[PDB]
Design a protein around this ligand. Structure first.
Ligand SMILES: C[C@H]1CCOc2c(c3cc(Nc4ccnc(Cl)c4C#N)ccc3n(C)c2=O)N1
Ligand SMILES: C[C@H]1CCOc2c(c3cc(Nc4ccnc(Cl)c4C#N)ccc3n(C)c2=O)N1
Lengths: 131, 131
């Protein structure tokens, strides 16, 4: 079944949020309605500002600023690892975090900078299990 | 717990898609980064084009059209009921469909026009149960 009676006595669709996210990622792959390019060192990543703000405390602060909300290019701190950013941008659009021994430190540092706390907490838990 | 091992051996976050949708609806309530106004008769509804395209075959067609993708105002067919549109716009941003005996016919006609098939199918199932 695709729906259920929610706690508030309203009909709720089980797969709706994941289907919207799937379609937003499809728009990203096809470069449709993307309104910003995130520059990390020499790498560029096209995205939708609303998705970035919905997933990151840093992007939420930047795109609510009256002056920065209109910028089409956003440059991140040059210390940010582009692969770590790519993994997190993929996570924002998919709910899947490709965490590996070789990338976990850069993904954790990038999530700290981007203010994605649950991702930071998860990284710490996986690091603690290795020690 | 907030995560699990997905079928593809990747870490997946259970609440991520619903949390992104919750934040997109918060942006809509605060009128932040909304880039279109949908006009239905005398009523106006501000929204994010990406969310509309992700939820409707009609909006997906309109906003992928090279000429219409740039429009800041979109006028719907004057026969469309504004309450039916409002209920569906709320559903797009929340996963909850406020279906009632008094609105089900207008919600079904609006979902047919907007090309939201599962909503149409659900409306038909609820109508069939009343007859
Ligand atoms: C889905 C989740 C994934 C990553 O974890 C986090 C967020 C996360 C998101 C926001 N963004 C809003 C927070 C509150 N209200 C609004 Cl309208 C918006 C937006 N847009 C701010 C701060 C956030 N923080 C600290 C996170 O740790 N997003
Ligand atoms: C979440 C769900 C809610 C309502 O049910 C429907 C959609 C629905 C969505 C689209 N939109 C895309 C369909 C395929 N690919 C992309 Cl990139 C995009 C976008 N954006 C097209 C057609 C759609 N149809 C016929 C529906 O019945 N959305």
């Amino acid at each position: 079944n695709l729906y259920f009676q929610g706690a508030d006595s309203c009909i709720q669709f089980t797969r709706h949020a994941s289907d919207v996210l799937l379609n937003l990622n499809r728009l990203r792959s096809r470069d449709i309605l993307t309104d910003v390019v995130i520059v990390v060192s020499r790498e560029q990543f096209r995205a939708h500002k609303t998705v970035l703000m919905a997933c990151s405390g840093l992007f939420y602060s930047i795109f609510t600023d009256q002056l920065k909300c209109n910028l089409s290019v956003i440059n991140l701190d040059p210390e940010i690892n582009p692969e770590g950013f790519c993994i997190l941008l993929d996570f924002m659009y998919t709910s899947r975090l490709n965490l590996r021994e070789g990338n976990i430190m850069a993904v954790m540092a990038t999530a700290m900078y981007l203010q994605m706390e649950h991702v930071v907490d998860t990284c710490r838990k996986f690091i603690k299990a290795s020690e």
